[model samples]
Target: ASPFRLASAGEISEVQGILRTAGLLGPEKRIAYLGVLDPARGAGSEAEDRRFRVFIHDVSGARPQEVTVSVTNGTVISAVELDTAATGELPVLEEEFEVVEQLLATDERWLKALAARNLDVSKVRVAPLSAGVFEYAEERGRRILRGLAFVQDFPEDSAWAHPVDGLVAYVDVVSKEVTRVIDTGVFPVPAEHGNYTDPELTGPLRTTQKPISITQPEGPSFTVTGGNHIEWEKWSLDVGFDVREGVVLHNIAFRDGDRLRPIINRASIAEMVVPYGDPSPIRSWQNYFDTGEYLVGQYANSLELGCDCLGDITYLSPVISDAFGNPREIRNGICMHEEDWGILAKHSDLWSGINYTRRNRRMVISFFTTIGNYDYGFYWYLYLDGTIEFEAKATGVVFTSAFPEGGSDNISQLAPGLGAPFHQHIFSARLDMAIDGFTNRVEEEDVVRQTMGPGNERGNAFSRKRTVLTRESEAVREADARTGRTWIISNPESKNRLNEPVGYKLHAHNQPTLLADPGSSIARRAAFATKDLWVTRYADDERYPTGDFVNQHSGGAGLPSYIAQDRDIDGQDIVVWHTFGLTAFPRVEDWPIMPVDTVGFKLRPEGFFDRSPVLDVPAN
Candidate 1:
C-alpha cells in the first residue's frame, strides 16, 4: 500500500516530521548535503587535519543568532551571538513567466500534450521553470550537472521579447539538450515580504552602509532571486531521463545555501560498485592508503573505462564502507545502491576541475550530511608516514572593481585616485580551486654582512653561505582546517604545482566621472593596461567577503570551517572539502532524491588546455 494512503492524519503528521528531518528546512533555503549517515565518525586521527569556509547571507534583516547543533559525540555545541551584518547586495524579484508558454507552444501538438498535464499560460507564469537534474559521464570524469529550460514573459516590445512569441529562453548553461520532459502542474507562489522577526539579543549597525545591488534584469536586469531567506524559496523541475523515456516530475528540496550554494540537490552520476575478484581491483584507488604515483593510475583507469565504476574507485577495497557494515563487493554492488542516496559532500570519492582564463585548480571533497536537526559537516586528510618533504597546495584571493575594464592592476599603491578601489558589482564568488607543489627539497642562500657580521667587515667582502635540506620523503603534509583548503596537486597533468595563479576582483564604484578612459595617447598609466579581472565593491559594502571564519563549533552558517576526516586520494594523505549550513523544511514536491540538480564546487585543470578549454568543452 502507498505510504500516503496508509497514513492517517496522525500518520501524515509523522510523515511531515520525517520529511522535515530529511529535507531542507524552508522553501527558499538550499540543501548542500543529504546522504546516508556514516557509522564511522569523521576520520581525524587516521589522517592529517584540515579546514574549509562557507558564507551565508540573510537578505531579510534577520541574522542567524543561535543555530542549534547536536554533534556526533551527542554533545550540543552552545551557540553565541556575533555582531555581523547581512548584505542586501543581491535583490531577488518575481517576474512574469507567461512568455515561456508561447515558446513551448510553438508546436501546437506539443502544446496539446502539455495541456493534458495542466501546463497552460496562466498556470505556467505562476513560478520559475522546473529544472531537471541528472548525471553526466565524460571522458575526463563523471559528475552531477543540472539543466533547466524556461521561457520568461517579455512585454510586447521589450528588446528581449519577440512580438510573436513574447518569450526568451532561460538556461543555467548551454549544451542542455532535452532528453525527457516532465509536466508538473502549476507551482505555488511565496508569502508576502515583511519586517524582520527574531527572538534574540540583537545588535545594530554602528554606521549605515549602502547595500550592493546584485539583481540583474532578465537581460541586464537578470538578477538572482530570493537571497534573504533562501530557505523559503521552493524549487521543482520536471525531469526527463534516458531511463524514464518520458518527462518525470521531481520536486527539489534544498538543505540550505550555506555550504552547497548553487549546487543542485542530487546524487553522484558515477556509481561505486565492488568487483568480484578477491583482491578487489578497486583496492588500487585508495584515496589516502596508497603511496604517491597512484593518483595517476586512478585517473588513467577512468580513461580506459570511460566511467567511474568498481574498477575505477581506488579507495573502495574496503568499499568506502556504506551505512551498513556490509562491504560492497562486485560490479553494480552495494556502492551503487548507496550512491542512489546522493554523494556525501566529502566521502563521495570524487574530484572536479574548471578554469576561467589564466587561473585554475583542483578541488577535494570529504563528506556531506543533510538530514534533520543534525547537519554537522566533516572532512578527510591523508596521514603521511613522514615520507614526503614538501607540502603542496593552492589558495585564492577574491577581487572587486567599479569598471569591468579596470581590474588586472595588482601593483600596490595606485598612482592617484584611480584604478579599482575595492567595492562594486559582484555579489559573491564560487571558487573551484586546486593546489600542487612538492616541498621536499633543499635551499641554499648567502648571507651578507649587515651592521655587525663577524668582525663587521669594513669592505663587506666576506659572505656566509647557508644550505638547508630535508629528506625528500620525510616531510609530512598537513591541511589548514581553518581555511577548508582543497588541492589537486595529485593531478600531475592538470597544473604546475610550483607556480599557479587564482583569484577574482571586486570594486566600489564605476562611473563617467570616477575615472578616465585611456585616450588614443601612446603613454598610458599601468591601470589602462589591466582590465577584465576587477569586480566592484561599495565603500561600505558588506558582501565583499564571505567564507572568512572556520567554525570549530557547529561549523558557522556560511563557511563551515572544521576538518573532520583524514582521506587518501590515490594513496597520498590529502584533505577533502566539506561545509554545512542551516535549513527549513521540505515539501511534497521533493521526493526520491530529486533530479540532477546537486550542490558542490568545480576546478579547472591549470596549463592543460590541449583541446578546447575544459570549460569551453561543449556538453549537451
Candidate 2:
C-alpha cells in the first residue's frame, strides 16, 4: 500500500537486471535514475500500486529512454525513447568526465591556446560543464560539455583560483573527442596560491575564540527506530534519497495528542540556477542549472562527525545509481541530530520571584555536496514549536575569472586581478504540502495599512487581509517584503477550535528572484526562479520545478507548460513551489575559501494547533 521507501541495494540490482533482460540496458546504454516511481503511477485510488522508474541514457544511439517497471512482478510496464527535441540530452555520465579531460589533453587547438598563454599543459585542470541552450548550430543534436580550463601550481593545489578565463573547449560526449576550441582573448592566470587548507600561505590561523564542546550525556533526545525513520519530540518523517534532488522528506507530520497530523506530504529542493551577471561573451553563457544538469546526490560528501556535523549524529548512508547502472553507497550522506537553541518560551513574573524559560530544541536533517568549485548544503529543521525551516548553505571558493579592469561594475575584485563575478544562486523548493490532508488550498496573507477611518480617527489603522487563490494562473506570486506578505496553505475539511481551516503560513526569505531580463535564456529555462511562489494542481509526473531533463533543454518545459491549463486550485490537491536565495557580489574577505552563507524559508503553524504544542514539558 505504501512504497515510500528509497531504493534498496537488492532492489536496485533487481531493477538493473530487469532493464538488462529487457534489452534496454545494452552495451552503450546506462541508467540515469533508478528509484521509486510516483505513488500516483497507479491507475486510480482503487488500483494504486508500487513501481520503479528507470531513466536510461541510450548513448548507443544518442537517445534517452524512460521505463516503468512493476516492483512486485519484475515486469516492464512501459518503455519509451524520449524525444530529444522535448526533454533534451541526458545528464553527462561520470565516465565522460575523464574522457573529456583526455580529449582536451590531445586536442591541438587546446594545446596551442595553452602554449600561447605560456602554461604547462600537464598542470591544467579542465572542468566539464553542461553546454547551455543558446541555439548554436554546430552544438545541435550532440551530447556536448564545455570544458572550462583552470590551472594549479601543483596537483594538490586548488585550480579555481587560477582560471583560464578566455578559452573554452567543446567536447563531444558520446564520440569521446574534443570537437573544437574557442579562445575568447586570453588573460594572464591570477598567480596567487588559493589552497586555503595550507596555513603557510595565509601565515597563521585565528586563535581568539575559546574551545567549546557539545554533548548529550543522556544520549540524544531523538531516536532512529531501526530504519531511516526518525522520531523526535512531536515530529516524525521519512528520509528518501534521490540522485538529483538529494535528500527528500516524505509524510512529514506531527504527533497531536495520540494521532499524527500530516503537515507536508513530500518535499525536496527541486532546482538551483547560478546565473552570472556579465554581458561579456566569455561569461555570457555562464548561467547553469545546478541540481538538474549535474546530479547533487552523485557528488555527496561522506559526512564526518567533528567536521561536517557535530553532536550526537545519526548517519543515513544513501545508495545512488552510478553511471554504469550500479549502486554506489555514499557513506553517511545524510545526518540527523538535535540541537539546543537558546529559548523556546520565556517569561518573567512581575510580582512573583519565579522566572519561566523553556529550551528550544531543533531536529536537523541535512546533507552536503560539492558541486565543482562550490560546496552546498541543504538543511531541514523541525522544532517542537510546530515550525519547519529549510536552509541552503553556500560555502566554498569563489569561481574566479581574470579581471580586465575595463570599467565594469559586474565584477567583484577579490584579489589583485582575480575577479569574482556577480551571480545569484536561485533555488526552488517543491513542497507538496499536506497541512492536514491532500485537498488543501493556498491563500496569501498580507498586512494591509488602511487610511484613517472612523474606528481610527487618531490616524493609525492596519489590518491583515487574506486573499484566496482560486486558479493556477492567478496564484503565481512573488514575495513582497513591503507588506510582510506570507502565504497560508489550509485544509478546508480540517477545522480548528476557532472554526477555521487548519493551516501553516510560509515566511519567505524575501530575497530577489531571478535578476535576468524577461527574454533572457536563464529566465526562460529557469522560469520557476522568476517568481517566489508557484501553486500547481498536483500530478505524478510534475516533480521538478525546472523540467525533469534540463540538460540543454529548450524553455517552456516545466512551470511555463504546467500552468497553461489554468486548473482550479481553490479546493483541490496542489503543490506549492517556493524559490529563495541570495545574490553574491563577493567581498575581498570571501577570498581563498568563502565563509558559509545561508538562505531559505520557514513554515510556521498559523491555525494548525488549538494550543501550543510544547506546553506539556515539566520543569526540570
Candidate 3:
C-alpha cells in the first residue's frame, strides 16, 4: 500500500482482468468509468489503497453496475446495480451516440416534422443530449438521450445558428427505438451562419496587430517528474486527469522555508449545473449537469502550440477509455506552464536605501473541454506568493433556440431570428483543504462596519467578525458582498509566528445562486449550486457534488444528502466547496464566437505564513 496515484494503463489492465474474470466485461457490457478509490490518501503507509472503482454499462441488458476491484489484491471487492428510479441514470455512452441518429432515420413522426420546416434530412444535424429527469411516465426507466436538431447548409456549417425548436426525439439506446416524438409547430431556422472558423468569411486578418511571443531562454522554472508531480516556485503538487473532471490537483503543498506545508489534499471541479431561465414548457426542463452527465475530460480538445496555449508549455497526454474499454489518448490533454503575473510586490520609496520589486510568476495547470455547443477551459494556478486560484473560461457558441421572428420575451435575440435563453453556468469546486495538516477547522469571517456611536467615537470604526463553523449545517452559508465575507480554513495544532492558527482563506465571488424555482427539477437535483460555500468533514466516497450518478438523477442526492449527516466539522479534516459562476443573457456581441468569459475563486495564505511570502526579491 502506498499514497494515492491516478489509475495507470497497467493498473487498468489489471483491473480489467479482475472485471473480466468476474463476468463484468463482455461484448455488450463495457466499463463506463474507472477512478481511484484511495480511501487512505496516505493516512498510513500500510493502509489499503489499491481499490479502484469501475462503472459498467450494458447497452441492452441490466444497465449500470458499479463495481470495486483491486489489482494489488487481485479480486473484485463489491458490485451493485443501481436502482434507476431511486438513484438516477447512468452516464450517456459514446457507443450510444451514433445509434440515436440511426434510430431517428425511420421515425416517420420526426421525419414529418422536419419535412414541415422544409429542411433537408441529410443536412439536419442532431445532438443526443441528456434528457433530464421529470416524471414523464413514457420516459421513465429508460436509457435515453433526448435528440435536438440543427440545420446545416453544408458539412462544415455551424448548425448551432439554425435550431429546430419545439420538436424533441426521445431515443432509448437500449431498446434501439425512439420512444416518443414531441412535434410542436416548428419555427423557421435562422438564416445567419455562425461559422466563425471560416477563413474566407473572417479574412482580412488585422495587420495592425502584432504577435506577442513568450520564450524562456534559460528553460522553464519548474520540474515535472513522471509527468504528474510538478514542482514550481514554492508549490509542489500532483496533477491528475479524470474522465469526469479534466484536471485534478492532489496533495497541494507550499514549501515554507524548510517545511513542506500541506494546504489542500485534493481539489477538483466537483460539479457544474447550467440551468436556463426560460419559463416556457418546452424550455422549462433545460437543466444540464455539464461536469456530471457528459464527462468533460473525455471530450477535451487537442491543444496546439500557438493556438490553444502560448508560453513555454509542457503538455501531458492523458489516457482514458470509451464505454467499450477502448483506450483514447487525449494528446496534449493537460497543459502546464509558467506565467509571469506582472507584479508580486512593488514600491517606489523616497530617499530609500534600497528600492525593491519582485516579479510575480504562477504555475498554471489547465485543460480545455468542449461539451456540445459550449467550450470550457478549466485552469488552476499556484502563485509564487503562496496563493492558489481556479479559473474557468466559458466560450464557444451560445446555445440558440428559436423564438418568434421579431423576437419574443425570455430570450436574447443574438441575430435577426436566433434566440438564446438567459442561463447560469454555476461551478462548484471541491477544495479538500489541508492547512498544515488534514485535521483543520473553518471559520466564517465578515468585515462589519460600525455605527458612529460609543464603539465608534470618531465615526470611523470597522471590525472583522469570525464565527467558527462547529457543524455542517452552520457551515452551509452564502457569500455576502455587503459584509466582505470569506471562509478561513485553519489547522488548530499548527500556529504561525504570530500565535495564529496556520490557515488559508477562501475568497469567493459574490455570484448569484441557482435561480430556478426551489421546487423545480434543477433545483432538486443540483442543490449544491444554491449556496456559495459548503464545508463538510472529509469522506472518501463523498466526491462528486451531484453524487455518483447524475445522468437522469432526481433531486436530493449530492450536497443536500451530504449535509443531512450534520456532523461536527470543527477541528477536523474538512472539505470546503466554493460555488461561483456567471449569469448570461447572450448579447449580440456574444454571437459568432463568444469572448472568453472567466469566473473562479482564490485561496490565499491567511496567517498560514507570518508575513509576505515574497517580501525579499531581486528587482530584475
* Per-residue lDDT over 553-590 for candidate 1, one digit per residue giving the tens place of the 0 to 100 score: 11122211111111123322122211211111121121
- Model 3 stretches with alpha carbons more than 4 Å out: 39-42, 46-48
lDDT of 2: 0.85
lDDT of 3 by residue, 197-244 (tens): 777768877789888989998889999886578888888898888888
Per-residue lDDT value at 354 in model 2 = 77
Candidate 2 pairs with clashing backbones: none
Top-lDDT candidate index: 2
lDDT, residue 219, model 1: 25
Give all TM-scores, in the order shown.
0.21, 0.96, 0.97
Q: Write candidate 2's Cα lDDT for 1-620 as tens digits.
A: 24566677777777778888988888888887666775663345655456788778876565788889875688899998887766777766777777777888888999999999998989899888778788687666678887888897887999988989788887888877788788988788999888887878777888898867888889988887546677899898888888888999988999999889999988899898899997776677887777888878878899999788998898999887776667789999999999988788888998897799888889999999997889999999999899999999999889888887574688878887788889999999999888887889999999989887688997787889999899988979988899999999999999999999999999997999999998988889999999999999988888888888888887877887898889999978899999998999999899989999999999999889999988986665
Q: What are the C-alpha RMSDs, in order, of all predicted structures?
A: 26.4, 1.9, 1.7
Clashing pairs in 3: 524-555
lDDT of each: 0.20, 0.85, 0.84
